[PDB]
């Protein structure tokens, strides 16, 4: 009553790592527990494809790429991931009349460039990609069910609106679970599931007349169709928490008439530039492509590894923030050059392989580093401290390789572990 | 009257529910680390006087696979030691026949052993311990056993392990793994810790006179020095279970005066050829180098993956056993070829990405395969059935790639998972 409740999944029969994640449904770090076995069903909101993507977009998709690699490569969860493409939107329609190429052709062009930018940043494609334009029929059926459950109504003009008041009345439903204080139509807060088509706009048939999906209904529809009635993880940037994500929860609860569609809602922090969110509207943005003419994938990923994913970060342009990233990337490149040369030039015939006190001290540091990094990853994917641990280990390996007689097997094993963590970070050396 | 075994406590340990065939219990028992997720592992190494053969490959490749499963798949932290017996009666005899120094012979065949391991994609251990570099430590180890009253000195300057005295202690049992395999000596079963050397043999100083280590003492000494008083895993071929490994247990228990030096003792089965152990003494052997002039590393590793590590296996020469290995290797090569090209040439601009029933069916089989393979690895490293599970999945992916419009992201994830399992098997495509 008056405050939304959250049900932690039961631990019996689940993979239990003791990972804690910052859950927006609880506004707290809570233990992450799969709904089933070691499986993670994960939906992440995708871009609206009418122009080039920028560094703020990169921060969200790279940060969740890192989290996905930690979940899969490091913890060995089984991740089934869906990302949508909003290729029907007011912005796409308006941009297409300006550009005088079909709306489909414009949306497809900027979707293609989005995925090329993701590939350039070594971001893994999701399991499924759901374009609104390929799901309109399913969206209509989804809305039909919400109406049948009495949680939406049809206006005279042919639009369909979600009935917030009817939804709240139900004891099993709470509206705006994540931002309770942020809250033709019955009430102003009602939001469109189906918009009657304006003249000259692209449109689709429905029982209520020609129209387009509303802003939020595609994500509930697509995630529900592929992933079902319980998502382990839903993600997006913090600006989407309300109204978009809270409205997705209400739509999906209305469709299934249950109380918890998402177990863990994860929200990345914004990249700021000169104190403000990097934003197309503010014209303060740097495109991913322009960033990539000056900096590499590794350097950009290090920029993001240095900042906790769920906190905001400041980007100082003109290379100021990238100085440290370039230095770190260079130290990793040089570390690999040196250790590979030491391994290559090692001669078993002329060496002595006695396990010395220096060998033992490096090994002790090595195993300790593994446990420190494990605790950092369990602590809500703390990559800044994990990256620091790798840097400290590399500093000691460099000292060891310069003076001590080297244990070839130990150096190889350390290199393989650092390779393993770098694969988890998405770095390529 | 029968040896007891203490299962490690589960509190605070990484618990995977892995079961392993433990020679100390003659049964499959749950594997539990002594500390956290750490595995201290000693494996007996070669005697370096001649070339390694396919039977040696079977043992070192099988335990390489187990190590990759433990590390890459389950994420245990393995600290592994392998010794090199570069002082031995066989080395001395061979070196006089060929008229070269004992060290020059041993370094040559140690070098060829590691080259053969690398050719088979076998990972080097953390530490490599040569007897010739540990003689001083062996002397100190023997001094302690004498001080604990479990060894005696003969008039000629040899030191023998005192089986009768060791057994008398209520905390010690002699021959824990093969209880039934049991003039100057007190009892015939007593075995040398230090052998008085003939003036023409290589020898080292000691409190008891010039001599050489006995046959078993080097392994207790080296493992105890580097890994300590409790090993999680000790491994070797089944012929070493007695007397060599049972004697290591007695020596190490006598040194530490405790009851369990090794928690899990793993013994690989022998590779036979025409019904008999592949053996230098029988002159029925195939060198690893000769095998690699006929078959690839992948094909040889598939041969071993097809046979449970702890069971004996028959090798039929003249290509008979390798027919199936070549076919499997060919099917993996052709699968990777197609999936890599389909991923590389996929065009996001022109495709349709609707998640169809065929996509869903392949995804269901994919996740199911992950669970089957997990159960096989937990079942005492059952690679034959995991390999079969991969083959079955590949057959369905090949059908999907031929007919259905392809989900690029699903194919990428399948490719990455199969790569992950092939990394765990040590296959390279
Ligand atoms: N790497 C993995 N692959 C597939 N299933 C897993 C994995 N790790 C844990 N599980 C599942 O997690 C549940 C409990 O994990 P555990 O108690 O660690 O065996 C079982 O249903 C297992 O099948
Ligand atoms: N400046 C930014 N920093 C971090 N994430 C952002 C930024 N701008 C947009 N995003 C996220 O990028 C994703 C796509 O943004 P949009 O295309 O605006 O829907 C959403 O999850 C947004 O929250
Ligand atoms: N991947 C890993 N890396 C380092 N330590 C681990 C790992 N998995 C489990 N552990 C350790 O195992 C003990 C208990 O495991 P758990 O209960 O799974 O956290 C703790 O001391 C953990 O640090
Ligand atoms: N035919 C064989 N099959 C499997 N393992 C063997 C075979 N011959 C020797 N080994 C193992 O290879 C390792 C080194 O053997 P050796 O070089 O004979 O001391 C030991 O663990 C032996 O048990
Ligand atoms: Na309510
Ligand atoms: Na908002
Ligand atoms: Na006894
Ligand atoms: Na034996
Ligand atoms: Zn969305
Ligand atoms: Zn040994």
Provide an overview of this structure.
2 copies of one chain form a homodimer. The first copy, chain A, is an alpha/beta fold. Chain A has 2 domains: 20-315, HUPs (Rossmann fold, 3-Layer(aba) Sandwich), CATH 3.40.50; 322-425, Four Helix Bundle (Hemerythrin (Met), subunit A). Chain A contains 13 helices and 14 strands. In chain A, β12 and β13 (276-277) form a beta hairpin. The longest helix of chain A has 23 residues, at 322-344. At the A-B interface, β4, α3, β5, α11 and α13 of A face β4, α3, β5, α11 and α13 of B. Bound molecules: adenosine monophosphate (4 copies), sodium ion (4 copies) and zinc ion (ZN) (2 copies). One adenosine monophosphate binds at residues 45, 47-48, 56-57, 59-60, 236-237, 239-240, 268, 270-271, 277-278 of chain A. Chain B: GO terms for molecular function: ATP binding; cysteine-tRNA ligase activity; metal ion binding. Chain B: This is cysteine--tRNA ligase.
Query: Biggest interface and which pair forms it?
Result: A-B, 44 and 44 residues
The share of residues in extended strands of chain A comes to 5-15%
Number of domains of chain A: 2
Q: What would the CATH topology of the largest domain in chain A be? A: Rossmann fold
Report the strand count of chain A: 14
Radius of gyration of chain A: 25 Å
SSE-based structural type of chain A = alpha/beta
Strand-and-helix sequence of chain A, N→C? EEEHEHHEHEEHEEHEHEEEHHEHHHH
CATH class of the largest domain in chain A equals: Alpha Beta
The shape of chain A is elongated
Q: In oligomeric terms, what are we looking at?
A: homodimer
Describe the largest sheet of chain A. Answer: 5 strands, parallel
